[PDB]
Design a protein around this motif. Structure first.
Motif, PDB file in Angstrom:
ATOM      1  N   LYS A 158       0.796  -1.222   0.000  1.00  0.00           N
ATOM      2  CA  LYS A 158       0.000   0.000   0.000  1.00  0.00           C
ATOM      3  C   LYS A 158       0.825   1.267   0.000  1.00  0.00           C
ATOM      4  O   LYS A 158       2.019   1.243   0.300  1.00  0.00           O
ATOM      5  CB  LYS A 158      -0.925   0.029   1.215  1.00  0.00           C
ATOM      6  CG  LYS A 158      -1.851  -1.156   1.342  1.00  0.00           C
ATOM      7  CD  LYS A 158      -2.739  -1.013   2.564  1.00  0.00           C
ATOM      8  CE  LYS A 158      -3.705  -2.175   2.671  1.00  0.00           C
ATOM      9  NZ  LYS A 158      -4.647  -2.000   3.805  1.00  0.00           N
TER      10      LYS A 158
ATOM     11  N   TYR B 247      -4.366   5.551   1.668  1.00  0.00           N
ATOM     12  CA  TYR B 247      -5.534   5.554   0.854  1.00  0.00           C
ATOM     13  C   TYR B 247      -6.365   4.287   0.803  1.00  0.00           C
ATOM     14  O   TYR B 247      -7.199   4.126  -0.098  1.00  0.00           O
ATOM     15  CB  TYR B 247      -5.116   5.930  -0.565  1.00  0.00           C
ATOM     16  CG  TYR B 247      -4.190   7.121  -0.612  1.00  0.00           C
ATOM     17  CD1 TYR B 247      -2.804   6.972  -0.470  1.00  0.00           C
ATOM     18  CD2 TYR B 247      -4.699   8.404  -0.774  1.00  0.00           C
ATOM     19  CE1 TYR B 247      -1.961   8.081  -0.487  1.00  0.00           C
ATOM     20  CE2 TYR B 247      -3.867   9.513  -0.788  1.00  0.00           C
ATOM     21  CZ  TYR B 247      -2.507   9.351  -0.650  1.00  0.00           C
ATOM     22  OH  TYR B 247      -1.716  10.477  -0.674  1.00  0.00           O
TER      23      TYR B 247
ATOM     24  N   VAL C  88      -4.866   0.940  -2.019  1.00  0.00           N
ATOM     25  CA  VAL C  88      -4.089   1.421  -3.152  1.00  0.00           C
ATOM     26  C   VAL C  88      -2.639   1.031  -2.938  1.00  0.00           C
ATOM     27  O   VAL C  88      -2.063   1.336  -1.890  1.00  0.00           O
ATOM     28  CB  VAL C  88      -4.182   2.947  -3.285  1.00  0.00           C
ATOM     29  CG1 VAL C  88      -3.364   3.411  -4.467  1.00  0.00           C
ATOM     30  CG2 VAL C  88      -5.632   3.357  -3.421  1.00  0.00           C
TER      31      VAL C  88
ATOM     32  N   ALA D 218       0.388   3.733  -9.473  1.00  0.00           N
ATOM     33  CA  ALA D 218      -0.494   3.616  -8.325  1.00  0.00           C
ATOM     34  C   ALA D 218      -1.636   2.723  -8.792  1.00  0.00           C
ATOM     35  O   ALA D 218      -2.193   2.943  -9.866  1.00  0.00           O
ATOM     36  CB  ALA D 218      -1.021   4.996  -7.912  1.00  0.00           C
TER      37      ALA D 218
ATOM     38  N   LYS E 176      -5.286   1.171  -7.517  1.00  0.00           N
ATOM     39  CA  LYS E 176      -6.372   1.042  -6.560  1.00  0.00           C
ATOM     40  C   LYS E 176      -7.012  -0.301  -6.857  1.00  0.00           C
ATOM     41  O   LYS E 176      -7.310  -0.610  -8.012  1.00  0.00           O
ATOM     42  CB  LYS E 176      -7.407   2.147  -6.745  1.00  0.00           C
ATOM     43  CG  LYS E 176      -8.547   2.105  -5.726  1.00  0.00           C
ATOM     44  CD  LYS E 176      -9.568   3.205  -5.968  1.00  0.00           C
ATOM     45  CE  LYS E 176     -10.553   3.313  -4.803  1.00  0.00           C
ATOM     46  NZ  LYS E 176     -11.623   4.340  -5.019  1.00  0.00           N
TER      47      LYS E 176
ATOM     48  N   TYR F 226      -8.630  -3.607 -10.833  1.00  0.00           N
ATOM     49  CA  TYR F 226      -7.575  -2.608 -10.708  1.00  0.00           C
ATOM     50  C   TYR F 226      -7.966  -1.332 -11.432  1.00  0.00           C
ATOM     51  O   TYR F 226      -8.872  -1.322 -12.251  1.00  0.00           O
ATOM     52  CB  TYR F 226      -6.285  -3.082 -11.366  1.00  0.00           C
ATOM     53  CG  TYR F 226      -5.490  -4.153 -10.665  1.00  0.00           C
ATOM     54  CD1 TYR F 226      -4.341  -4.667 -11.266  1.00  0.00           C
ATOM     55  CD2 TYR F 226      -5.866  -4.654  -9.421  1.00  0.00           C
ATOM     56  CE1 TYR F 226      -3.585  -5.655 -10.658  1.00  0.00           C
ATOM     57  CE2 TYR F 226      -5.110  -5.654  -8.794  1.00  0.00           C
ATOM     58  CZ  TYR F 226      -3.972  -6.146  -9.425  1.00  0.00           C
ATOM     59  OH  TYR F 226      -3.215  -7.132  -8.846  1.00  0.00           O
TER      60      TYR F 226
END
Ligand SMILES: Cc1ccc(NC(=O)c2cccnc2)cc1Nc1nccc(-c2cccnc2)n1
Length: 275
Positions: free
Chosen positions: A23, A29, A32, A45, A47, A88
């Motif tokens: 993360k 966050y 993420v 990045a 998520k 993703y």
């Protein structure tokens, strides 16, 4: 996927193309992670969402929105993985993290007055673009901006109303709201418009001018609306130029129609960016 197929999506990419790490710890966050796009050896990045079934519909409506927006000051979408399970959403990685912490931890001799103005000009540019596109942000705040190399700043949206482990987002009917960044009409009639983003921008300006202090310092949330109705407004921060503060003031007009548009705000900053 293949251009030969119904619903071909240029944004869909293969998971195996990305290396997952751990993360992102900044303010953290949620789900993420920092990852690497082998092909280009790029840090990105990502998520994710795999068991939070409640989101799927919402996690997917997010992806769709990000495909519809492109601007140099909006976090750049790189690809999605909305097919197989572990979903993703890949975005570029911004070297210096969110703008709130950045402002609080920076070398103030480097991040001087001219750099703060540059950061506000970039943000207003992204917002002028969104205004033109008729898109509403709804959560404009320094914690939602990212900083790159050369004081490059980009607006994003981390869906933090869920993260809030503090006083930032006070609950309001299954919906958390950052009261101190929310315009009057949004608190009263729950009406969100691009003019309420303009109100939030004024507060974002205050955050930048103070290097990341919390809005309405000391004042409790429950009296913010009443105070605003009685015409109370944060005072010009120490060292904040009069023209900038006057802009802050225009953004905080009680009547949303009296608030300037992002187009004029951006122009005001460019001009001001002279000298
Ligand atoms: C991985 C990711 C997934 C979705 C979105 N979405 C949005 O930013 C967005 C924008 C507009 C509307 N809706 C969503 C953004 C990201 N990017 C993202 N998310 C959290 C931290 C970071 C991050 C942190 C530190 C350095 N660089 C990037 N980046």
């Amino acid at each position: 996927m293949d251009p030969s197929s119904p619903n071909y999506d240029k944004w869909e990419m293969e998971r195996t193309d990305i290396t997952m790490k751990h993360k992102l710890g900044g303010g953290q966050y949620g789900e993420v992670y920092e990852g690497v796009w082998k092909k280009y050896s790029l840090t990105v990045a990502v998520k994710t969402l795999k068991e939070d079934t409640m989101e799927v519909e919402e996690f997917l409506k997010e992806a769709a929105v990000m495909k519809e927006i492109k601007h140099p000051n909006l976090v750049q979408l790189l690809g999605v993985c909305t097919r197989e399970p572990p979903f993703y959403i890949i975005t570029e990685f911004m070297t210096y993290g969110n703008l709130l912490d950045y402002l609080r931890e920076c070398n103030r001799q480097e991040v001087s007055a001219v750099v703060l103005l540059y950061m506000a000009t970039q943000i207003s540019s992204a917002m002028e673009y969104l205004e033109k596109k008729n898109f509403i942000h709804r959560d404009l705040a320094a914690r939602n901006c990212l900083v790159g190399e050369n004081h490059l700043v980009k607006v994003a949206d981390f869906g933090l109303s869920r993260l809030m482990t503090g006083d930032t987002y006070t609950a309001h009917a299954g919906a958390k709201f950052p009261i101190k960044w929310t315009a009057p009409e949004s608190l009263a009639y729950n009406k969100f418009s691009i003019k309420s983003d303009v109100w939030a921008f004024g507060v974002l300006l205050w955050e930048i001018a103070t290097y990341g202090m919390s809005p309405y310092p000391g004042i409790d949330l429950s009296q913010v609306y009443e105070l605003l109705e009685k015409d109370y407004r944060m005072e010009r921060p120490e060292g904040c130029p009069e023209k900038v503060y006057e802009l802050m003031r225009a953004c905080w007009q009680w009547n949303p129609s009296d608030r300037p548009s992002f187009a004029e705000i951006h122009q005001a900053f460019e001009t001001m960016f002279q000298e």
